[PDB]
From a paper:
To this end, the Gly76-to-Cys mutant of Ub (UbG76C) was tested for its ability to form a disulfide bond with the catalytic cysteine of a group of DUBs. Using this approach, two disulfide-linked ubiquitin-bound complexes were crystallized, one involving the Legionella pneumophila effector SdeA DUB and the other involving the Orientia effector OtDUB.
The OtDUB construct, unlike SdeA DUB (which only contains the catalytic cysteine), contains two additional cysteines (Cys111 and Cys116) beside the catalytic cysteine (Cys135), all of which are present in the core catalytic domain of the protein. Even though the protein sample remained as a mixture of at least three different species, crystallization trials successfully produced crystals that diffracted to 1.85 Å resolution. The crystals belonged to the orthorhombic space group P22121, with one complex comprising an OtDUB molecule and an Ub molecule in the asymmetric unit. While the terminal cysteine residue could not be placed due to missing density, the proximity and orientation of the C-terminus indicated that UbG76C could be disulfide-linked to Cys116 of the symmetry-related neighbor. Under the latter conditions, a single species corresponding to a covalent complex was detected, while the same dissolved crystals produced two distinct bands under reducing conditions (in the presence of DTT) corresponding to separated OtDUB and Ub chains, as expected for a disulfide-linked adduct. Within the complex representing the asymmetric unit, OtDUB makes only a handful of contacts with Ub, leaving most of its canonical interaction patches (the widely used Ile44 and Ile36 patches as well as the C-terminus) unsatisfied.
Residue numbers in the entry:
A (entry chain B): 1 to 75
B (entry chain A): 1 to 259
Amino acid sequence: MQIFVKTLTGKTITLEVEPSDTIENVKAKIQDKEGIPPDQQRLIFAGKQLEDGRTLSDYNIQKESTLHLVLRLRG
Amino acid sequence: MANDQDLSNPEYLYTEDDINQLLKHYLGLDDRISIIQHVALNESLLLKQTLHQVLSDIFSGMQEKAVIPLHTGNNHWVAMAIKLGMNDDIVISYNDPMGVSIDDKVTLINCIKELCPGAKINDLQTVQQTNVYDCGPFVVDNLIKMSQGQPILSTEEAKQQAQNIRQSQVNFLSENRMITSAAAALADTLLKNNNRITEGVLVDRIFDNKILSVQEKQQLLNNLLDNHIKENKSLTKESLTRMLASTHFVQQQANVLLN
């Protein structure tokens, strides 16, 4: 299924995912596409930060859901 | 892989990516053709912005023509092509493989009238698709013929050739999946643990690679130098894979690279 990730620069990333994908898997896909290290990524769905070892279905992410991506400063 | 990814299924349903890969294969050597990747009827703003961008590039001479597989519904794509006619006018040719007039897609029409009311619209309105799964093959074949200035398949020709055009397209899709998988494996070995790599680091990693022979490094690097390694761009896994997939090297050694 298709999900979208909003970024602070106003661009929307489109990802192809499975409900069984881990959050870490989703961060790996963002790294593959955007060059962003997973350790710099914090993902949010509907007011909940996404924990790396959970799956997309743990958060009831749906087809065409939108996530929010925030990058860490420094680190 | 999911069962709905099996190319041997005569009823395989094309994805947006399949269509894009086929148009790039059959039309993409000509840099002056815009191949539009993701545009849908249920995205009025994005659709108006993409059409504005395409018409601007054709008017401003940066592009000669454009092919647009427009997604209108469940597994349904319509073929829209845009080009410069012989009378200093923009010519919009269109065919729905179901034979529905362009007037049924009012959001598209009102978008074209709003953006270019002085464009000519050739709605070829030709029934071709005879089942729910053949929209993919025909949008691809239509866009190629329209951008070549050749007549699209008639209703009767479409019935005879439906299986042939699908066969040769999925033959490419199968070869292309292999090339992309090889390119992605090679990208992994070159990227190591990095989030991005510069073209300069890419060159040094190919030099230092302990798997490829001297002759393989030489072919790969000559391929890259032909179109890349000019400004030390920073690459991701995705853009490196695309770069490698386009090399003669990976196309000629994809199987060796995977086994």
